[PDB]
Amino acid sequence: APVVKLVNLILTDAIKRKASDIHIEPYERSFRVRYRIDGVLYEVMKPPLKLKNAITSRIKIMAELDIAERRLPQDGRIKIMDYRVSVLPTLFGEKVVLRLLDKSNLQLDMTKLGYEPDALHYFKEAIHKPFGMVLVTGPTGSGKTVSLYSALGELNKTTENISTAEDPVEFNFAGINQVQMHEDIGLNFAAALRSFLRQDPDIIMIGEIRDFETAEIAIKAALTGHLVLSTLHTNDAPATINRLLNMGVEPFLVASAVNLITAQRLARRVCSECKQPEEIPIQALIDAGVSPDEGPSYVCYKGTGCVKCNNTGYKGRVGFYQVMPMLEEIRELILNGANTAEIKRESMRLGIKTMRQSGLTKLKEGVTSFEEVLRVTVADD
Amino acid sequence: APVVKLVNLILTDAIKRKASDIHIEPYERSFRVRYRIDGVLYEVMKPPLKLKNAITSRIKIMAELDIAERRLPQDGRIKIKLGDMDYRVSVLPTLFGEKVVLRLLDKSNLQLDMTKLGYEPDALHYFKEAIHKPFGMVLVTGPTGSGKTVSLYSALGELNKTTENISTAEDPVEFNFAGINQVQMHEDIGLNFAAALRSFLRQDPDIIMIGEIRDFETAEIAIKAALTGHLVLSTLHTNDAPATINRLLNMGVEPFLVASAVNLITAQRLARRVCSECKQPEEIPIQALIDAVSPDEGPSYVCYKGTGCVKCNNTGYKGRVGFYQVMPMLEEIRELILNGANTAEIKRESMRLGIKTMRQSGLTKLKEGVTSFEEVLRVTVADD
Amino acid sequence: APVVKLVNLILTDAIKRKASDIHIEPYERSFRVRYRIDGVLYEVMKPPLKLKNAITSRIKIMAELDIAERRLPQDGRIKIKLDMDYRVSVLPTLFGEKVVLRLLDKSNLQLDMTKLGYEPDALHYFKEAIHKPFGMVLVTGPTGSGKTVSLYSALGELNKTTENISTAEDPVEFNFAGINQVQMHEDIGLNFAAALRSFLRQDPDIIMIGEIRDFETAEIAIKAALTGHLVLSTLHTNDAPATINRLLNMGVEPFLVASAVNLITAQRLARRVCSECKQPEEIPIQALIDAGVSPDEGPSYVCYKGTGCVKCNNTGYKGRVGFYQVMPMLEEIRELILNGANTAEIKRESMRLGIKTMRQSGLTKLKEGVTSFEEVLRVTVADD
Amino acid sequence: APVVKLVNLILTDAIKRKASDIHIEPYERSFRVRYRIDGVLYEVMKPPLKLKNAITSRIKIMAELDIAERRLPQDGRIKIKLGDMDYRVSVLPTLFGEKVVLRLLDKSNLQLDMTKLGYEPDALHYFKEAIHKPFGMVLVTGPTGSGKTVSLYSALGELNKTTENISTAEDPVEFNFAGINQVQMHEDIGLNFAAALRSFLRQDPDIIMIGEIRDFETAEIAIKAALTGHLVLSTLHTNDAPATINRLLNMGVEPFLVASAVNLITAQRLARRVCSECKQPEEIPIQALIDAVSPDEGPSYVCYKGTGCVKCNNTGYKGRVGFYQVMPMLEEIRELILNGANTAEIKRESMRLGIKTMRQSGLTKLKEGVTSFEEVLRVTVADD
Ligand SMILES: Nc1ncnc2c1ncn2[C@@H]1O[C@H](COP(=O)(O)OP(=O)(O)O)[C@@H](O)[C@H]1O
Ligand SMILES: Nc1ncnc2c1ncn2[C@@H]1O[C@H](COP(=O)(O)OP(=O)(O)O)[C@@H](O)[C@H]1O
Ligand SMILES: [Mg+2]
Ligand SMILES: [Mg+2]
Ligand SMILES: [Zn+2]
Ligand SMILES: [Zn+2]
Ligand SMILES: [Zn+2]
Ligand SMILES: [Zn+2]
């Protein structure tokens, strides 16, 4: 059947389009294909609804998945480019999602990630301190894994033992030993982490801590003399500090044993070809933004769209990073029971920028637009 | 199995008939199969008493009801093929038998428009401003038949866009939406709320919707979906917005987990609204009206009570106007769950912050003349 | 099968090579064996991936460990004869099981204090602390810094038929006749606190606890100190002065921190230059003066770097030595504790007194030609 | 069974010897049986290593210890026939064995006089006035070896009269009283705290005494005995007087049941008292002393610390002075358990009512010069 040609075309054009996700959704009256491009969905196709069972069925064949059951979700992988395949039992048919993991495009360069020079310096200084904790925070898809893999990429050596427990493992690294864990058999982050301490590790990587049990082991791994990398899901960088205390972690451990906390979120890049100045009133800029020391200097760009953009006005993505090293003063505020507003107050006062401030500086450089700054970052104060 | 074709024959006859209501209830002396047309009920069938147990058990199979317990009431719903059909079944143990009542459900004529749902303007501001975040979870609480599903569809219809992946899991789906991913689950095959969530997280959802969380297994990974960077919509049956926090804590969810995850709790209940034509002013002692209310605005209240007409069938009301309590989660409320909390003290905090509770909502609808004091006192507990 | 010979070869070459740790790690493409030698990892092997499942599998047999599960971590001990015994940790890596073997050398325990690189002046203080009838002496540093070597040597230093000495370790890394050693297991309900509570009921003279992780053990241990017992323990901190502040941050009141502790030491390890190939390296005096040394005698310094040789397998370094700061408490430091001084102030006075920093211990060791300049800069942190 | 006659031979030799302390502890290389005479310890025996497990297990049979767990510490006591003898046993798991320590118990020289026990005059008023009612229950809380049994004997010796039936159940009986009915229970035969109470209620007791209530089964019928019209005396191991109420509520006892039944909770702990001859004034910053104390009376404190002599064996203390917190149950406290309660809020209420807590008690004994700041900080948590 021609159906073979179509399934490959959907996967081939998704790679051509640099989409990070593929969606095949049947509906009652409709059938649609969506590509997610720079975190945003666009519908690239309308294949005929007669074929809905044929198009999905072969993708399960490629995944070595059972075609016989349409009533239940199924999961798997496909290597061709390689994709994580997720199947779901919608009322009107099965919806298939293919989420690509691109091995070659992973940057693995920190200067290339949009880190500001000062922020990069704190992060680099933080990761090479032995016996410390690095927390990378943000929502899903904010670049935590990309940032963290670059950190693991920056230090890898024959001289050190690096051990990682991830759920799932996003990419295979030579030289770094990765554990994939699934809870149904009893492997949790804590159990894998306790196993790590008996292996004589140097560097320890754990994807996230949702639990006090895992949190306590990981903070104990920091004080033992190993560098431990992890993530947390939070509204801002400071709030991870107060959330650790809410996890039940004693203040002295939070202050003493963790070197750094970062927060990052992702905004789309303005197109290099189509960008043109937009005139945004300085008072809208100042109302959330910098006071008008910089106001005359700001030039804000937006793309009109072109063939390069597929008429979106945006091509690519850039990080907005807030990097908070743990200051002696931050340690004192933790030890004193300080609240979140005061912790951010001193952090800004002491010269480490916020996410809105870092994003807003990227706007002055012309990398991102103003509408993206307001869409992504949360208003400060 | 002629009783099977005859069991369906009763429902099809009730389709041809105008009756909205059907009753099979068994007796030892006789067997009553009844239809209610235009509110009056009539006996239809005197079918076999030997197949009475067989038929009643069969209709229980249609509803996903457990036959293993005949001693306790069981409620549910069914779908029938038509060119669609849906019924809601209510089963009660009888001394001589098991009664089964089927009440029609009309899924049409109910729209999504969020302006007409009756949210108070300040309340709609909180609900609408809460339902757009990249981060959060929303909970709509009330009894079955409170219009919770309609309120969430209104939020969904406003949230639905071609730029996002919005998926829903409910059992059944009340309405069919074009473009929203809907998974209807029946637990016999192993489709479950929890299983639906674990399937959602691998699909890259922008927005997850699941109808209610009845337990921890669903609540744990639902809250995890909220902290992941997604938006979560659900319902619970509880007394209030703060009562929702208490039940969440009793399920075993950690206190920081609740205060971090959900940015909204909104409870509502439907109440009969007085007739347009039959409403007449009814004087009430203002002190009693005051007792429920602000004494300053007390004398300005005139509450209307309907008498009856051919439109309302002498009920003295017409439609349904809901009373809403919407509780965004404030930093103040956030600090109270984390420093330790009590249902009453959370009620006090939200109520001093300017968040209006159900009773005061029904009162404003009382002053406006939409409802009556009788109905407000029925559907709402006294705050003080 | 050759697997037997190959496994023994991996282990026997580890003993000849004086490695601290053995790693057999499978990957997707390559396969590797690593030895840790003098705190630094070097890969000595590339066995074929066909034997990878066999190589791990036989080691499990040697450990009396279950072959049936390849999906879970396993731990155990192995004793073999040429006799050597060391532990095993197995982990389920994506492409296979990685096995780590960490050598515990039975007859190689140092047992001598001067042999560890203690400063002549520092050693007197350490001995003075451990021979007092009451109070606690704390030795701090990261993992692998030799705290266990120092503590076992201290218990070795004073042991007598006249005293009952009791130690709680997790795990015990060596068995000594005359000292009664219990290996602690937390899963069975035995913690440091629970083990310590029994110790106070056993009528000890001197008590050893591996580390204090929290207040619960800290309070019990400090109360044992004031009882008339000498208690040996460790804490994880950056240096000796900060250990005082770590106790206070745990919630111990200042008066007990001053009164109940005799001394605090911190120590770390730097690699030792080759006996054969060592040669002078030229370090500019201004770079060394700004950090390494105050601007007196700096011109005289002779800095070494090894060229590498067959003795070192061209690493330039053979063996390692400790850098020690040993700080008994003078009344002036005790007075600052009682006055609420911060860490810098205690560090200022600790430095102002006879007490040498960790950099100072390394820099004196560099002048003797024992260690290089790169090692002194790599391990200890600059004091100001 | 020659090891049995030899096991007793060790204890009898320790009787002929002056040693207060015996240690069997096993080793793999050797076997150490040690006695401690005049505080110095000496190795006595090098008995068979083959019977080491046999002997150690046998001494565990003497103590009512469970042999089924060798992996965890077990503590207890034994009696020996002499013309009486009693020992307290402490068992600890060892890597190579199980250590057993026996420490002598001298039951003589401790009298009942209630004036010399050291209850503060206002505290003794509450305790003595509480221990006579026809209705109530008394609870004396503290750690093992706090003199709880001695305090209750003092109350008993004052309560004992020929006009009343006073019965006691404890395991073992510390002292033998003439005229008091004493039942010593060992749970193997089925004598139990609960069984002893059900036997008491049928005997028409005026006063019931039972040593501690470890569970609900005893607590339920103990409280019932208090409401019956009788007087109940017991102990618990807890942190404080209010902490006792919290544990009682956690056992499942209803809140009205606690507030109705117990009219007293008194916690105490023994602390070393400074030497008479060796006490010298030791100046302490009054602000720190103040921090623990009333700032008005702060400058008037002079606290004494002992140095050493031949009498105290250079310990710097001599005797034991207990710190007492006695908490009669006030109507104010009564209303707080019934309206809902918190450990901290009960502490606040009793402390504003004029009831003095442990810390302030130790401070008055500090100002009087009986004890020292070091000891007070060891045995008492800071109230504020
Ligand atoms: N600085 C950057 N420049 C370009 N692309 C980026 C940058 N940071 C992140 N991305 C893109 O965003 C995605 C981040 O996803 P990922 O980090 O895996 O999510 P998570 O961190 O939640 O696991 C990646 O696919 C990557 O291509
Ligand atoms: N002064 C020293 N000289 C030689 N080797 C040492 C010295 N200190 C530590 N080591 C090495 O360190 C290892 C033990 O480290 P350990 O004392 O267990 O550190 P930790 O107390 O952090 O666990 C031993 O194998 C020993 O070879
Ligand atoms: Mg990830
Ligand atoms: Mg150790
Ligand atoms: Zn363009
Ligand atoms: Zn009407
Ligand atoms: Zn060499
Ligand atoms: Zn003395």
Numbering used by the authors:
A (entry chain C): 181 to 260, 268 to 568
B (entry chain D), D (entry chain D): 181 to 263, 267 to 475, 477 to 568
C (entry chain B): 181 to 262, 267 to 568
Give the exact sentences the study uses for this entry.
After screening several PilB constructs, we found that PilB from G. metallireducens (PilBGm) formed crystals that diffracted anisotropically to 3.4 Å in one dimension and 3.9 Å in the other two dimensions. Three chains could be built in the asymmetric unit, and an elongated hexamer was identified in the crystal packing. There is anomalous signal in the predicted tetra-cysteine zinc-binding sites, so zinc was also modelled into these motifs in each chain. In four sites, ADP and magnesium best fit the electron density, even though no exogenous nucleotide was added during crystallization. These nucleotides must have been pulled down from the cytoplasm of E. coli during purification. Herein this structure will be referred to as PilB:ADP. One packing unit, packing unit 1, binds ADP via the Walker A motif with magnesium coordinated by E357 of the ASP box. The PilB:ADP structure also contains an apo interface between two packing units, where no nucleotide is present.
Despite the importance of the T4aP and related systems, little is known about how the motors of these machines work. It is thought that the energy for pilus extension and retraction is provided by hexameric ATPases in the cytoplasm, known as PilT-like ATPases. The typical T4aP system has two PilT-like ATPases: PilB and PilT. Here we determined crystal structures of PilB from Geobacter metallireducens under non-saturating nucleotide conditions at 3.4 and 2.3 Å resolution.
